[PDB]
Ligand binder design. Structure first.
Ligand code: HEM
Ligand code: HEM
Ligand code: XJH
Ligand code: XJH
Ligand code: H4B
Ligand code: H4B
Ligand code: ZN
Lengths: 411, 407
């Protein structure tokens, strides 16, 4: 079968065949579209087919499909599964797998970069202190004094599900949030529950507006342990505006390294429950979402007050005006400090070129429009006008339950 | 079978059961989501008629009554006899209001029950259609105090006697390709404008030429009519801060009036059913003015603002976008022509969704269309999960008539 997508701005039409290789389910049916829903131990039996499919994909990619080396590797994995119930990936297969999980990530606008991913193999790690060391090295490598480099660190795979490696933090670097008795929040409201966990575990909270959270790390299914990332490894950018001199006095800053730590990486049926990865920011992630969401820092009012905009009616577009100024400030600040960032125009234009190339070379590019379209100025970016097909390919990054809801406390 | 939707800003969860009624298909499957694609006998008619009357009689608390069974008998008799049937005025009005209620791409549905329905089923000629349409235009415009309205022309019969309005909207501006290589006026309407010329229209060849109506009655060749200018309320565009804005020579019309869709009620098909409401400001200021394939004015505006257009990261496009949209709202409000901003409209839609969940068990909504084309995440609809499904009565797309009509 062939499926067409159309760009309504350019009339360019593309043909997708890659969707035929998708097996996992979307949430949608013939009767209902779930495209805007945020969240819509394996047997030996189910494991060898997943391994075989992955290895066939790997061997095809290196132009060795059906070779002696391909056949011998299938036999070796087969033997290992029946004998031990699982298998180990070769370093080459792990690198290919992690790159392809990023390539397949339909909610990621940054995928033009997918083939440049530094993979750190941490499968020999055994303790939380060992995880802390791997993570510091990742942060220092990825930060590169502001010249950011994409990286992922991969801890040992799930065995029986009772010995999981997990980073409890949702991102490696994030700010604390504190609920006050009067109901107001100090710091980042998204991180209140996690901050409470840290405090309970013994973190002495400074109780400010931008306190970098400690890492909470779980090795081998044991209770997690706290660690403070060395401050010299945490690059931060003070936010100021090119024309508005009062902007600095809002006291805003943000960290340079966006690093997702709560997802699960599936490669050939194996499950890597701790696989922190990082790239660099697109400006709207900070200036639109982190700063201006009602349930996040929520700074729109204070900024619009300072700009002296007419705030009595929504129809003066004061919120829209303040939004653009904050986003200009974020890009200006990062660029001035020589910390890698991309604006939403550049990033979406690059994504369209990536997508077109993927269709030609791969037969498709699964993409989730709801997530790819930026959260401001949607239709003046080329992605708004681009039809997309969303489907699930493996290797993949998946969501997993927060570890505090599932962990068995050993005490 | 029961489905939950969460708002990620407020944590409110609603439960959807209304989707189980849904009959038509979405284009998605278990393996692929088509959420962002723009367009994804006698025997057939009685289940469709039945399903409709059942919901009609339920809505007036008379389900299973003698009037209910009687009407079901009467329509059954008429289909068996004539191969079609005729709606009672009450059913037509109900069907039309519900087609709006079921429109998953429409953010303005809080207004669904306040719709003036003009029954034009007695219409026979294109001059007659012109009369009905002028009357609709005048009524809906109401000298700037806009009222929602639909005019319904006779239903499909054998499909060779189709009523159609060839225009995509009742009021739109012409588009012309020039020797220059550029486009004068609205590039979306270039083809339709050509069809107007080839059928006889004398084009002024300006930037904002109100198009003529091309009306097809009873499957005949369509005919041209100029809408009386004094019935077309237009708004000159100016800015409350920038005195130079007015010299861009921009204007828009006050009445948004979709005329190319098909209304389906109880299996009956109404191929000419122009309807109108009032504008949300972004439709004009973001899409009409700033789409690259539309009036595409961002460059000119940014230049007059003297922004740094050297790099994308100065956000010069975004700054100009906001100002253009401020001018749209200010101009309509100053001239007392009804308009809604995207903040107000999306706030209302969330309230409407809550009413629908509470009173009907759900609300079909297409997130891709509901979230405004600028400032998405500062509107509450961005953070609201929505389930998309197709309920009838409905508005449906249909082929452009020039590709289909046999002259
Ligand atoms: C190189 C620069 C990159 C940029 C500019 C970028 C951009 C983005 C953005 C803007 C999002 C949406 C974030 C949100 O709204 O929460 C995202 C999501 C995502 N990206 Fe990237 N990305 C980059 C690198 C990476 C890397 C290195 C990986 C993994 C190897 C990755 C995998 C993902 C995944 C799995 C998501 C979905 C997250 C979720 O569902 O919460 N990206 N990307
Ligand atoms: C009263 C004020 C109204 C407002 C503010 C409003 C708002 C909107 C907006 C912004 C759109 C998206 C338009 C686009 O991007 O092309 C839309 C679509 C739509 N609306 Fe409304 N609407 C209103 C009245 C109506 C009425 C009276 C009807 C029918 C009786 C209706 C039915 C529809 C339909 C069927 C669509 C989808 C059109 C398509 O798929 O092209 N709306 N509405
Ligand atoms: N520029 C880049 C580079 C790499 C990765 C990203 C992803 C960016 C970088 N910070 C966070 C963001 O993803 C999130 C944000 C918030 C929650 C989250 O997890 C979820 C999401 C939905 C439901 C439940 C949990 C993921 N952005
Ligand atoms: N504020 C209101 C009130 C009622 C209706 C509307 C819908 C508003 C009123 N003008 C325009 C808009 O409909 C369009 C315009 C152009 C294309 C379109 O969708 C397509 C796209 C491609 C092919 C076919 C249809 C829909 N907006
Ligand atoms: C309900 C809705 O799906 C949700 O708010 C989504 C919309 N699109 C998004 N897109 C991105 N990139 N990130 C997000 O957090 C969201 N949130
Ligand atoms: C391809 C994509 O579906 C298309 O550009 C859509 C996106 N969302 C939209 N939303 C509205 N309200 N109107 C539109 O025309 C569109 N266009
Ligand atoms: Zn879908």
């Amino acid at each position: 079968r062939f499926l067409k997508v159309k760009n309504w701005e350019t009339d360019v039409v593309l043909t997708d065949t890659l969707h035929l290789k998708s097996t996992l389910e979307t949430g949608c049916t013939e009767h209902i579209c779930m495209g805007s829903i945020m969240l819509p131990v394996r047997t030996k039996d189910q494991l060898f087919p997943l391994a075989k499919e992955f290895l066939d994909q790997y061997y095809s990619s290196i132009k060795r499909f059906g070779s002696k080396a391909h056949m011998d590797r299938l036999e070796e994995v087969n033997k290992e599964i029946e004998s031990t119930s699982t298998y180990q990936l070769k370093d080459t297969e792990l690198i290919y797998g992690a790159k392809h999980a990023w390539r397949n990530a339909s909610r990621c606008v940054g995928r033009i970069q997918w083939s440049k991913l530094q993979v750190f193999d941490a499968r020999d790690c055994t303790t939380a202190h060992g995880m802390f060391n791997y993570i510091c090295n990742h942060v220092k490598y990825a930060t590169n004094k502001g010249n950011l480099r994409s990286a992922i660190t991969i801890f040992p795979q799930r065995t029986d599900g009772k010995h999981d490696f997990r980073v409890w933090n949702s991102q490696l670097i994030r700010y604390a949030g504190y609920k006050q008795p009067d109901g107001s929040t100090l710091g980042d409201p998204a991180n209140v529950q996690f901050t409470e966990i840290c405090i309970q575990q013994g973190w002495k909270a400074p109780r400010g507006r931008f306190d970098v959270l400690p890492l909470l790390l779980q090795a081998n299914g044991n209770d997690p342990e706290l660690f403070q990332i060395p401050p010299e490894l945490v690059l931060e950018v003070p936010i100021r505006h090119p024309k508005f001199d009062w902007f600095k006095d809002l006291g805003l800053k943000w960290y340079g390294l966006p690093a997702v730590s709560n997802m699960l990486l599936e490669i050939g049926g194996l499950e890597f429950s701790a696989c922190p990865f990082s790239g660099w920011y697109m400006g709207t992630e900070i200036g639109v979402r982190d700063y201006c969401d009602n349930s996040r820092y929520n700074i729109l009012e204070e900024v619009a007050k300072k700009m002296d905009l007419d705030m009595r009616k929504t129809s003066s577009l004061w919120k829209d005006q303040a939004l653009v100024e904050i986003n200009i400030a974020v890009l200006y600040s990062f660029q001035s400090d020589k910390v890698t960032i991309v604006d939403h125009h550049s990033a979406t234009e690059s994504f369209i070129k990536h997508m077109e190339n993927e269709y030609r070379c791969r037969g498709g590019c699964p993409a989730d429009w709801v997530w790819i379209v930026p959260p401001m100025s949607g239709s003046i970016t080329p992605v708004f006008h681009q039809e997309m097909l969303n489907y699930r390919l493996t290797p993949s990054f998946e969501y997993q339950p927060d570890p505090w809801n599932t962990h068995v406390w050993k005490g």
